Ligand SMILES: CC(=O)SCCNC(=O)CCNC(=O)[C@H](O)C(C)(C)COP(=O)(O)OP(=O)(O)OC[C@H]1O[C@@H](n2cnc3c(N)ncnc32)[C@H](O)[C@@H]1OP(=O)(O)O
């Protein structure tokens with residue numbers, strides 16, 4: 001009893017509120033907009049009865065691989081941000097969001113790998129990512145504003 005669709009401009013202040021409720025990393029309005037315009041096909045929301053209850057915001061880029069050691073550039077997707085409102089957690093929504101985004105990154109944007117950063121103490125997200133075959137690649141020391149470390153996590157597409 002949730003449905004998944006691509007995010008639209010009208011979704012964004014609902015998205016921003018979700019972000020502010022669930023996450024310390026609170027991006028300004030234009031940030032969400034630029035990513036919706038640039039990588040929209042992989043940017044999904046989860047809807048319950050006309051309200052947004054979750055989102056995933058993607059990025060697509062050229063960069064060096066986290067999966068293999070090559071001197072040349074590869075096309076990568078990144079999970080910039082993902083959140084599901086507490087009320088609707090453990091229903092498979094974050095899983096459905098990430099799979100939908102990964103599919104688009106692969107098919108619409110020709111990314112060959114995806115990565116993200118997650119707090120070393122965010123054990124629910126880590127568990128989620130690991131169930132989706134994400135692996136720990138690196139520890140990013142003092143990555144977050146409050147000084148906490150991050151796992152850089154990655155997987156092939
Ligand atoms: C920005 C970044 O890239 S990292 C930040 C991630 N987002 C946040 O921290 C915001 C606060 N937290 C949340 O919004 C959610 O808890 C999320 C995004 C981590 C997961 O949302 P959910 O919809 O509940 O995840 P989902 O239902 O798809 O769970 C799938 C699997 O993930 C694991 N998992 C998810 N949440 C938990 C949890 N609290 N405790 C233990 N395992 C969990 C489980 O193995 C779960 O499988 P199962 O429920 O069938 O046993």
Ligand SMILES: [Ca+2]
Pocket residue numbers: 117118119122125
């Ligand atoms: Ca985190």
